A paper describes a structure:
To obtain further insights into its molecular mechanism, we determined the crystal structure of its core MTase domain (residues 470–699) in complex with S-adenosylhomocysteine (AdoHcy), which is a byproduct of the methylation reaction, representing the demethylated form of AdoMet. Based on its sequence, MT13-C belongs to the family of Rossmann fold-like 7BS MTases, and, correspondingly, the determined structure of the MT13-C MTase domain reveals a classic 7BS structure, consisting of a twisted 7BS sheet surrounded by six α-helices, three on each side. Although the homocysteyl moiety of AdoHcy was not fully resolved by electron density, the MT13-C structure indeed revealed that residues in these motifs (Gly503 and Glu524 in METTL13) are involved in AdoHcy coordination, and show a similar positioning as in SpdS (in complex with MTA). Moreover, MT13-C and SpdS share a short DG-motif (Asp551-Gly552 in METTL13) localized after β-strand 3 and not generally found in other 7BS enzymes. The localization and orientation of the acidic aspartate residue in this motif allows hydrogen bonding to the primary amine of the adenosine moiety of AdoHcy and MTA, respectively. For SpdS, two aspartate residues (Asp173 and Asp176) in Post II have been shown to be important for both tetramethylenediamine (putrescine) substrate binding and efficient catalysis, and interestingly, MT13-C has an aspartate residue (Asp575) at the position corresponding to Asp173. Also, the other residues of motif Post II show a similar positioning between the two enzymes and MT13-C, in particular, also has an aspartate residue (Asp577) in spatial proximity to Asp176 in SpdS. To explore how MT13-C interacts with its peptide substrate, we modeled the 6-mer peptide (GKEKTH) corresponding to the N terminus of eEF1A onto the MT13-C structure by molecular docking. The highest-ranking docking model placed the substrate peptide in an evolutionary conserved groove with its N terminus oriented toward AdoHcy, i.e., an orientation very similar to that of putrescine in SpdS.
Residue numbers in the entry: 470 to 578, 580 to 679, 681 to 693
The structure:
Amino acid sequence: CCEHHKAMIAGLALLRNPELLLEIPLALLVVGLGGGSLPLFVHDHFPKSCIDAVEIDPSMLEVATQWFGFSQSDRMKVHIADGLDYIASLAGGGEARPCYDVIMFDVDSDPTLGMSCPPPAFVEQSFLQKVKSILTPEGVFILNLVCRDLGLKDSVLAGLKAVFPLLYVRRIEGEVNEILFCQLHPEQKLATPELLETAQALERTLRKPRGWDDTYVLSDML
Protein backbone atom coordinates (compact mmCIF):
# COMPACT_ATOMS: atom_id res chain seq x y z
CA CYS A 1 0.00 0.00 0.00
CA CYS A 2 2.55 2.65 1.13
CA GLU A 3 5.72 3.05 -0.92
CA HIS A 4 8.14 1.22 1.40
CA HIS A 5 5.68 -1.69 1.70
CA LYS A 6 5.44 -2.01 -2.09
CA ALA A 7 9.26 -2.13 -2.21
CA MET A 8 9.43 -4.86 0.49
CA ILE A 9 6.82 -7.00 -1.32
CA ALA A 10 8.92 -6.56 -4.51
CA GLY A 11 11.64 -8.61 -2.81
CA LEU A 12 9.60 -11.76 -3.27
CA ALA A 13 10.81 -11.58 -6.91
CA LEU A 14 14.25 -12.82 -5.69
CA LEU A 15 12.80 -16.23 -4.72
CA ARG A 16 11.78 -18.02 -7.95
CA ASN A 17 9.47 -18.09 -10.99
CA PRO A 18 6.77 -15.47 -10.08
CA GLU A 19 4.19 -17.61 -11.88
CA LEU A 20 5.11 -20.36 -9.44
CA LEU A 21 5.22 -17.90 -6.50
CA LEU A 22 1.42 -17.60 -6.26
CA GLU A 23 0.92 -21.34 -6.87
CA ILE A 24 3.23 -22.76 -4.15
CA PRO A 25 3.32 -22.40 -0.35
CA LEU A 26 5.44 -19.57 1.03
CA ALA A 27 6.44 -19.29 4.69
CA LEU A 28 6.95 -15.67 5.83
CA LEU A 29 7.98 -14.18 9.17
CA VAL A 30 7.19 -10.48 9.60
CA VAL A 31 8.48 -8.46 12.55
CA GLY A 32 6.56 -5.30 13.21
CA LEU A 33 2.77 -5.13 12.53
CA GLY A 34 2.09 -1.41 12.23
CA GLY A 35 -1.48 -1.06 10.97
CA GLY A 36 -1.28 -4.62 9.56
CA SER A 37 -1.34 -3.61 5.90
CA LEU A 38 1.91 -5.43 4.90
CA PRO A 39 1.04 -8.90 6.20
CA LEU A 40 -2.63 -8.35 5.18
CA PHE A 41 -1.54 -7.62 1.61
CA VAL A 42 0.53 -10.81 1.41
CA HIS A 43 -2.24 -12.90 3.02
CA ASP A 44 -4.84 -11.51 0.57
CA HIS A 45 -2.73 -11.69 -2.62
CA PHE A 46 -0.83 -14.93 -1.95
CA PRO A 47 -3.51 -17.52 -1.05
CA LYS A 48 -0.91 -20.17 -0.13
CA SER A 49 1.21 -17.87 2.10
CA CYS A 50 1.60 -18.79 5.76
CA ILE A 51 2.56 -15.78 7.86
CA ASP A 52 3.90 -15.50 11.40
CA ALA A 53 3.79 -11.85 12.49
CA VAL A 54 5.62 -10.72 15.63
CA GLU A 55 4.55 -7.47 17.30
CA ILE A 56 5.83 -6.05 20.62
CA ASP A 57 2.81 -3.80 21.44
CA PRO A 58 -0.57 -5.55 22.02
CA SER A 59 -2.31 -2.18 21.37
CA MET A 60 -1.12 -2.25 17.78
CA LEU A 61 -2.74 -5.64 17.22
CA GLU A 62 -5.91 -4.46 19.01
CA VAL A 63 -6.43 -1.35 16.84
CA ALA A 64 -5.59 -3.19 13.61
CA THR A 65 -8.06 -6.00 14.45
CA GLN A 66 -10.81 -3.59 15.63
CA TRP A 67 -10.62 -0.95 12.87
CA PHE A 68 -8.16 -1.81 10.06
CA GLY A 69 -9.56 -5.16 8.85
CA PHE A 70 -6.75 -7.28 10.22
CA SER A 71 -7.55 -10.82 11.36
CA GLN A 72 -5.80 -14.01 12.32
CA SER A 73 -6.46 -17.36 10.71
CA ASP A 74 -4.85 -20.76 10.08
CA ARG A 75 -2.49 -18.99 7.61
CA MET A 76 -1.80 -15.80 9.64
CA LYS A 77 -0.81 -15.84 13.29
CA VAL A 78 0.31 -12.89 15.40
CA HIS A 79 2.62 -13.37 18.38
CA ILE A 80 2.92 -10.58 20.97
CA ALA A 81 6.66 -10.51 21.71
CA ASP A 82 9.86 -8.59 21.17
CA GLY A 83 11.09 -9.88 17.78
CA LEU A 84 14.62 -10.29 19.28
CA ASP A 85 13.31 -12.69 21.94
CA TYR A 86 11.05 -14.46 19.47
CA ILE A 87 13.73 -15.11 16.85
CA ALA A 88 16.23 -16.18 19.58
CA SER A 89 13.67 -18.81 20.78
CA LEU A 90 12.94 -20.04 17.27
CA ALA A 91 16.64 -20.31 16.42
CA GLY A 92 17.17 -22.42 19.59
CA GLY A 93 14.46 -24.94 18.50
CA GLY A 94 16.96 -27.61 17.31
CA GLU A 95 16.23 -29.65 14.17
CA ALA A 96 12.58 -28.81 14.98
CA ARG A 97 13.27 -25.06 14.36
CA PRO A 98 11.36 -23.20 11.63
CA CYS A 99 12.59 -22.48 8.15
CA TYR A 100 11.14 -19.38 6.50
CA ASP A 101 11.29 -18.53 2.82
CA VAL A 102 11.09 -14.81 3.62
CA ILE A 103 11.87 -12.81 6.74
CA MET A 104 10.77 -9.16 6.81
CA PHE A 105 11.84 -6.55 9.37
CA ASP A 106 9.46 -3.59 9.45
CA VAL A 107 10.36 -2.65 12.99
CA ASP A 108 10.53 0.92 14.32
CA SER A 109 10.69 1.81 18.04
CA ASP A 110 13.34 4.92 22.24
CA PRO A 111 14.84 8.17 20.83
CA THR A 112 18.07 7.45 22.78
CA LEU A 113 19.22 4.85 20.23
CA GLY A 114 21.56 5.62 17.30
CA MET A 115 18.84 4.23 15.03
CA SER A 116 15.25 3.15 15.66
CA CYS A 117 14.29 1.52 12.31
CA PRO A 118 15.24 -1.14 13.15
CA PRO A 119 16.67 -0.94 16.66
CA PRO A 120 20.42 -1.72 16.32
CA ALA A 121 20.20 -5.10 18.08
CA PHE A 122 18.24 -6.47 15.07
CA VAL A 123 21.31 -5.94 12.82
CA GLU A 124 24.09 -6.90 15.24
CA GLN A 125 26.10 -9.79 13.85
CA SER A 126 25.41 -12.41 16.57
CA PHE A 127 21.63 -11.80 16.18
CA LEU A 128 21.97 -11.88 12.36
CA GLN A 129 23.39 -15.40 12.72
CA LYS A 130 20.11 -16.39 14.46
CA VAL A 131 18.17 -14.89 11.52
CA LYS A 132 20.30 -16.81 9.03
CA SER A 133 19.68 -20.04 10.96
CA ILE A 134 15.88 -19.78 10.40
CA LEU A 135 15.98 -18.77 6.74
CA THR A 136 15.87 -21.26 3.86
CA PRO A 137 19.16 -21.36 1.90
CA GLU A 138 17.55 -19.64 -1.15
CA GLY A 139 15.25 -17.37 0.91
CA VAL A 140 15.32 -13.62 1.28
CA PHE A 141 15.77 -11.39 4.35
CA ILE A 142 14.15 -7.98 3.72
CA LEU A 143 14.85 -5.01 5.97
CA ASN A 144 13.31 -1.53 6.16
CA LEU A 145 16.26 0.73 7.21
CA VAL A 146 16.30 4.37 8.31
CA CYS A 147 19.77 5.45 9.35
CA ARG A 148 20.68 9.16 9.00
CA ASP A 149 24.02 8.63 10.79
CA LEU A 150 26.08 7.64 7.76
CA GLY A 151 29.02 6.22 9.74
CA LEU A 152 26.65 3.89 11.57
CA LYS A 153 24.87 3.05 8.31
CA ASP A 154 28.14 1.86 6.71
CA SER A 155 28.84 -0.33 9.80
CA VAL A 156 25.30 -1.80 9.63
CA LEU A 157 25.64 -2.54 5.91
CA ALA A 158 29.09 -4.12 6.37
CA GLY A 159 27.75 -6.38 9.14
CA LEU A 160 24.74 -7.40 7.07
CA LYS A 161 26.98 -8.27 4.11
CA ALA A 162 29.29 -10.32 6.40
CA VAL A 163 26.35 -12.65 7.16
CA PHE A 164 24.35 -12.22 3.89
CA PRO A 165 26.89 -11.78 1.11
CA LEU A 166 24.35 -11.07 -1.64
CA LEU A 167 22.88 -7.62 -0.90
CA TYR A 168 20.51 -5.54 -3.00
CA VAL A 169 19.31 -2.05 -2.08
CA ARG A 170 16.26 0.04 -3.00
CA ARG A 171 15.99 3.74 -2.06
CA ILE A 172 12.32 4.79 -1.74
CA GLU A 173 11.04 7.84 -3.66
CA GLY A 174 10.15 10.75 -1.40
CA GLU A 175 11.52 9.27 1.84
CA VAL A 176 14.74 8.47 3.69
CA ASN A 177 13.94 4.70 4.08
CA GLU A 178 15.83 2.15 2.14
CA ILE A 179 14.97 -1.50 1.67
CA LEU A 180 17.72 -4.06 1.90
CA PHE A 181 17.24 -7.47 0.32
CA CYS A 182 19.71 -9.97 1.73
CA GLN A 183 20.53 -13.45 0.50
CA LEU A 184 23.06 -16.16 1.23
CA HIS A 185 24.55 -17.31 -2.12
CA PRO A 186 26.10 -14.71 -4.49
CA GLU A 187 27.11 -17.48 -6.99
CA GLN A 188 23.40 -18.19 -7.75
CA LYS A 189 22.42 -14.50 -8.23
CA LEU A 190 20.22 -13.44 -11.14
CA ALA A 191 21.82 -11.64 -14.11
CA THR A 192 20.45 -8.10 -14.71
CA PRO A 193 18.10 -9.14 -17.56
CA GLU A 194 16.69 -11.96 -15.33
CA LEU A 195 16.46 -9.47 -12.43
CA LEU A 196 14.37 -7.19 -14.66
CA GLU A 197 12.22 -10.04 -16.03
CA THR A 198 11.30 -11.49 -12.59
CA ALA A 199 10.34 -8.04 -11.22
CA GLN A 200 8.05 -7.17 -14.13
CA ALA A 201 6.31 -10.56 -13.98
CA LEU A 202 5.59 -10.09 -10.24
CA GLU A 203 4.07 -6.62 -10.70
CA ARG A 204 1.77 -7.87 -13.50
CA THR A 205 0.14 -10.44 -11.20
CA LEU A 206 -0.20 -8.09 -8.18
CA ARG A 207 -1.92 -5.38 -10.29
CA LYS A 208 -4.39 -7.98 -11.73
CA PRO A 209 -7.81 -7.40 -10.05
CA ARG A 210 -10.68 -11.84 -8.16
CA GLY A 211 -11.67 -14.94 -6.15
CA TRP A 212 -13.87 -16.56 -3.55
CA ASP A 213 -13.84 -16.31 0.23
CA ASP A 214 -14.06 -19.92 1.46
CA THR A 215 -13.84 -19.22 5.21
CA TYR A 216 -16.29 -20.30 7.93
CA VAL A 217 -18.78 -22.10 5.71
CA LEU A 218 -19.81 -24.83 8.21
CA SER A 219 -21.96 -22.57 10.48
CA ASP A 220 -24.26 -21.65 7.55
CA MET A 221 -24.39 -25.25 6.20
CA LEU A 222 -25.34 -26.84 9.61
